[PDB]
Structure 1
Amino acid sequence: MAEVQLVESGGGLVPAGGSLRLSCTTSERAFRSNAMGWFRQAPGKEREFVAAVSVLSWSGDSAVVADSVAGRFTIFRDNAKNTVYLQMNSLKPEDTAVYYCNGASDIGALQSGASSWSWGHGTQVTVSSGQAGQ
């Protein structure tokens, strides 16, 4: 593991069914030349893969998400901002965790739980039971 710039934000507290968008920004060469991914670690549980984007090809990338978040979370780059976003719609209580960004030389490594950089501080996501009815 090596210390690479990682800025992580977007966490917060929302009721089940709410949404948040996470942001991971890194330096430009790291952003372009590595696959980048989001992981999460819930209280009492092992850190696990959430979603990833591949190394940039000449004019594109590809994306994968964990089965448990399919249809709810969308991962994407904003190439202009060196940022990997995780749009989290329709959050569930079991999505509560600290979310962490990392990188690896290819997307299959991230999918297996592997990564290459020192971890940042992450961003805390708490999905509560619900909210008042009106």
Structure 2
Amino acid sequence: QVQLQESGGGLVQAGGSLRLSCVVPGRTISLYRMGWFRQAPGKEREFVAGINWSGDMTDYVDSVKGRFTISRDNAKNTVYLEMNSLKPEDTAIYYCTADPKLLPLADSSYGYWGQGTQVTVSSH
């Protein structure tokens, strides 16, 4: 019954923007951490951004600092990932994640995983 509904991915030219969205139906107070991980073929899965339940603490992988912003709207049970200045190395499957544990947002101990959304940054 814990569903992470992902949207917002697709194909985008380098320098362009996207907004990923992760909607969790129901009562999400127990999920203190929510975030995004990404994995491209042949590379290891990687933390991208995370946020706490109150929406006032965040963290990011260094390669996206200054380009991505994660935010949380509990009134709509949604976490958003605004992705600006996209680069080809941002190409990957992006996964919404959630976890109850009161650990650092970047600690890769997340127990709930979305099915993933493809993001492709073209340089043609």
TM-score, normalised by the number of residues in structure 2: 0.90
Distance 1:107 1:54, change over 3 A: farther
- Report the secondary structure of 1:124's partner residue: strand
* Greater strand fraction, Structure 1 or Structure 2: 2
Q: State which of 94, 98, 105 in structure 1 corresponds to 2:93.
A: 98
Provide structure 2 residue ranges, at least 5 long, that are not aligned to the other structure: none
Give 1:17's aligned residue: 15
Give 1:37's aligned residue: 35
Provide structure 1 residue ranges, at least 5 long, that are not aligned to the other structure: none
- Report the secondary structure of 1:94's partner residue: helix
Based on CA coordinates, which of the two structures has the bigger radius of gyration?
1
- Report the secondary structure of 2:27's partner residue: helix
Q: Deviations over 1:7-30 (max 9, x none)?
A: 001001011100000000113422
List, as ranges, runs of 4+ consecutive aligned residues in structure 1 with deviation greater than 3 Å.
none
User: What are the residue-to-residue correspondences of 1:1-134 with 2, within 5 Å?
Assistant: 4-30=2-28, 32-33=29-30, 34-56=32-54, 61-104=56-99, 105-108=101-104, 110-117=105-112, 119-130=113-124
What is the CA RMSD across the aligned residues, in angstroms? 1.6
Aligned length: 122
Preserved contact between residue 93 and residue 129 of structure 1 (Cα < 8 Å)? yes
Distance 1:65 1:18, change over 3 A: same
Preserved contact between residue 55 and residue 107 of structure 1 (Cα < 8 Å)? no
Preserved contact between residue 53 and residue 107 of structure 1 (Cα < 8 Å)? no
What letter corresponds to residue 80 of structure 2 in structure 1? Y
Q: How many Å apart are 1:106 and its aligned residue?
A: 2.9
- Report the secondary structure of 1:52's partner residue: strand
Distance 1:126 1:26, change over 3 A: same
- Report the secondary structure of 2:11's partner residue: strand
Q: How many Å apart are 1:107 and its aligned residue?
A: 5.0
TM-score, normalised by the number of residues in structure 1: 0.84
Preserved contact between residue 19 and residue 90 of structure 1 (Cα < 8 Å)? yes
Task: Report percent identity of matched pairs.
Answer: 66
